Amino acid sequence: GVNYLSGLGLSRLICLPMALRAAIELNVFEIISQAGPDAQLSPSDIVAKIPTKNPSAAISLDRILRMLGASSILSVSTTKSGRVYGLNEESRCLVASEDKVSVVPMLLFTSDKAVVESFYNIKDVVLEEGVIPFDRTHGMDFFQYAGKEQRVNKSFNQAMGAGSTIAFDEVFEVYKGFDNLKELVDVGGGIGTSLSNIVAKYPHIRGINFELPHVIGDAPDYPGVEHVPGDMFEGVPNAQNILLKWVLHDWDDDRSIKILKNCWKALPENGTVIVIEFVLPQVLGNNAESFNALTPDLLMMALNPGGKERTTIEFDGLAKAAGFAETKFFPISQGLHVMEFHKI
Amino acid sequence: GVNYLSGLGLSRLICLPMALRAAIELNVFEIISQAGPDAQLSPSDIVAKIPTKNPSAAISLDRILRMLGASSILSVSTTKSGRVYGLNEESRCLVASEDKVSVVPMLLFTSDKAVVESFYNIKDVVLEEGVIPFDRTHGMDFFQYAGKEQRVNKSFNQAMGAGSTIAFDEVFEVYKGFDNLKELVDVGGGIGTSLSNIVAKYPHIRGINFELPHVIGDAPDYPGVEHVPGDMFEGVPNAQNILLKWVLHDWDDDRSIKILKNCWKALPENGTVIVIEFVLPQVLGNNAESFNALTPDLLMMALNPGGKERTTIEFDGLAKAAGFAETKFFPISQGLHVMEFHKI
Numbered sequence: 001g002v003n004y005l006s007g008l009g010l011s012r013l014i015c016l017p018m019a020l021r022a023a024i025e026l027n028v029f030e031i032i033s034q035a036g037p038d039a040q041l042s043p044s045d046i047v048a049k050i051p052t053k054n055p056s057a058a059i060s061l062d063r064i065l066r067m068l069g070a071s072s073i074l075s076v077s078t079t080k081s082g083r084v085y086g087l088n089e090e091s092r093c094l095v096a097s098e099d100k101v102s103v104v105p106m107l108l109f110t111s112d113k114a115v116v117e118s119f120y121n122i123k124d125v126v127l128e129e130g131v132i133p134f135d136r137t138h139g140m141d142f143f144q145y146a147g148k149e150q151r152v153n154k155s156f157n158q159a160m161g162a163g164s165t166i167a168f169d170e171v172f173e174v175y176k177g178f179d180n181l182k183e184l185v186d187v188g189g190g191i192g193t194s195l196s197n198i199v200a201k202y203p204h205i206r207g208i209n210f211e212l213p214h215v216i217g218d219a220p221d222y223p224g225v226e227h228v229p230g231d232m233f234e235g236v237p238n239a240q241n242i243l244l245k246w247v248l249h250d251w252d253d254d255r256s257i258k259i260l261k262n263c264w265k266a267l268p269e270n271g272t273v274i275v276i277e278f279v280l281p282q283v284l285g286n287n288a289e290s291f292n293a294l295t296p297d298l299l300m301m302a303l304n305p306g307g308k309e310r311t312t313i314e315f316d317g318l319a320k321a322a323g324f325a326e327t328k329f330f331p332i333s334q335g336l337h338v339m340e341f342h343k344i
Numbered sequence: 345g346v347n348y349l350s351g352l353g354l355s356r357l358i359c360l361p362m363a364l365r366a367a368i369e370l371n372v373f374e375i376i377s378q379a380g381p382d383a384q385l386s387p388s389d390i391v392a393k394i395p396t397k398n399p400s401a402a403i404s405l406d407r408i409l410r411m412l413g414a415s416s417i418l419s420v421s422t423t424k425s426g427r428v429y430g431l432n433e434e435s436r437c438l439v440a441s442e443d444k445v446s447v448v449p450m451l452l453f454t455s456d457k458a459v460v461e462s463f464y465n466i467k468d469v470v471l472e473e474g475v476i477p478f479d480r481t482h483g484m485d486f487f488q489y490a491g492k493e494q495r496v497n498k499s500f501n502q503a504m505g506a507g508s509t510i511a512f513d514e515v516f517e518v519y520k521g522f523d524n525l526k527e528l529v530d531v532g533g534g535i536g537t538s539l540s541n542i543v544a545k546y547p548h549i550r551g552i553n554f555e556l557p558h559v560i561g562d563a564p565d566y567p568g569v570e571h572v573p574g575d576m577f578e579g580v581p582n583a584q585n586i587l588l589k590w591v592l593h594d595w596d597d598d599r600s601i602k603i604l605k606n607c608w609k610a611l612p613e614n615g616t617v618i619v620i621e622f623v624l625p626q627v628l629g630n631n632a633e634s635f636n637a638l639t640p641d642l643l644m645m646a647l648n649p650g651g652k653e654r655t656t657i658e659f660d661g662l663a664k665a666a667g668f669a670e671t672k673f674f675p676i677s678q679g680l681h682v683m684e685f686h687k688i
Binding site for chain 2: 002003004005006007008009010011012013014015016017018019020021022025026047050051052053054055056057060061063064066067069070071072076078083089090092093094097100101102103106107110111113116117119120122123125126127128129163166167169170283284285286288290291292294295296297298299301305308333334336
């Protein structure tokens with residue numbers, strides 16, 4: 001006794017995110033917020049702000065909007081003139097507010113043509129050992145594909161850029177392990193902008209930006225930020241403390257352990273490696289904490305199958321395997337963790 | 345006071361359907377059913393049946409599976425050895441059973457590379473009047489793209505083929521308006537296979553398969569099925585009753601009304617046009633009835649923006665505009681309707 005009719009509804013799964021992508025690219029969500037909170041708007045109202053001459057723009061727009069509303073991405077009320085759509089707890093994070101940037105750049109990256117087309121081959125990871133779906137799909141490394149096509153390169157750096165500052169704004173409120181440092185080497189720090197932000201919140205830290213020479217060349221002079229080039233696999237510059245923000249998750253356990261051993265060497269006694277990652281919860285459910293680790297884990301499955309998200313248990317396992325003595329875990333919010341690897 | 349952190353979870357929306365596509369292509373769901381009902385299986389168990397030599401196949405497989413389970417496409421229990429996954433009311437429709445075909449061909453079509461890539465431009469429908477996103481995306485009609493690339497052509501005919509027999513199996517149980525006919529012209533009947541099925545369930549109907557000459561040529565001789573070629577826009581062969589299964593929804597109101605007028609002419613007095621469509625409910629919610637009309641409506645938005653799903657009210661409006669006297673509505677299940685346009 002099986003109802004296949006309601007099976008055909010599962011085609012909603014591929015439709016929804018593409019409905020969301022359209023609404024994002026049409027600024028639907030900003031228009032609704034610039035009309036004040038608890039403001040539900042009409043399609044005609046919304047399209048009024050959309051630069052189009054199309055007669056049947058409001059009609060077309062609703063086809064997108066009423067799918068979003070059906071699956072609870074917009075609040076819906078039913079006037080007589082038609083349906084009327086506002087923001088709810090899901091969609092309010094699609095509009096920035098002053099410098100608090102939104103998740104839009106991350107949603108636009110993880111649904112990009114290049115990424116999505118590489119998701120058609122994630123089964124190859126199960127079937128053929130060591131295969132990389134993105135590289136099969138496009139016949140080149142992901143970063144190679146960034147260099148050749150700039151839309152893909154720009155969305156990636158915006159996504160992670162956005163991503164990092166959303167995460168840091170919450171670690172600064174909640175994580176107090178920064179308050180009494182005087183030196184921090186960021187491993188893989190880029191040009192140092194994330195680090196120069198940390199220095200500004202905690203000026204007492206003399207920051208070191210450790211990064212491949214070919215990156216730190218262009219680096220601007222940030223106050224309290226010193227650039228030193230190098231390869232984290234040939235060694236890590238000595239410093240009181242180390243910072244690893246979303247670096248462990250790009251690597252399999254072998255090269256993580258390699259990284260964290262090389263970390264251990266530079267640290268003094270009583271030194272700490274700060275790790276900033278999302279943490280796969282011990283028990284997955286339909287909740288924010290879970291999906292914040294499952295969806296990056298699936299992205300890597302397509303782009304970097306060696307990379308992976310990890311649990312508290314597994315993270316401690318990497319730390320002990322590398323030689324670290326004690327591990328403390330400070331959950332921030334939604335599965336984001338700050339973790340310290342202590343050398344005692 | 346906005347939590348952007350849980351915003352990053354919305355990237356789950358594009359991940360999920362691609363996780364579902366992988367599991368489908370790996371036969372995950374059949375493997376689980378061939379192990380008996382209420383059988384939750386381990387990743388290692390499932391991959392045991394998967395033809396791979398990859399050492400870390402079970403590990404990789406879980407990355408897909410635990411996303412499906414997190415969003416309730418699989419039932420999940422937590423043994424000590426790991427997680428264990430069964431079918432629930434959502435996923436049981438992904439396995440056929442004897443001739444009862446599953447929704448798999450439809451899910452595989454609506455998530456196909458060609459379709460999905462054309463979903464990146466559905467906003468163009470709002471912006472530029474009369475633009476067709478699929479034709480912009482691929483620089484050719486959809487059916488042209490079927491002819492050139494056969495994977496896309498084969499999935500389409502399987503999808504609708506599947507789709508039609510799932511729908512008919514429910515109309516035969518519930519719709520009794522077939523029991524006392526003796527003639528039925530199917531408008532747009534193809535080679536007649538859907539119609540030759542109807543004749544078999546109701547032999548007393550002398551069936552007529554009305555279709556473009558270039559289709560009905562290859563047509564096999566089905567008992568109780570007569571082929572006559574023609575163009576529904578230049579006229580419809582005279583018959584006691586007419587059948588319109590998923591034809592009205594491909595056309596805007598003008599050409600629907602054109603079709604239904606041309607229908608009216610051939611019918612006698614007391615004749616009926618049977619319409620088989622899904623019906624956009626007057627009030628959309630997160631339910632099967634809604635999504636069974638919203639998702640085809642969004643597909644057409646990408647492939648056939650002139651086509652559209654309609655409500656009971658709107659369907660009656662097409663019938664009265666064409667000259668029909670009375671309209672009866674018989675909901676089957678999940679938003680599927682059989683509707684008769686009466687000529688009295």
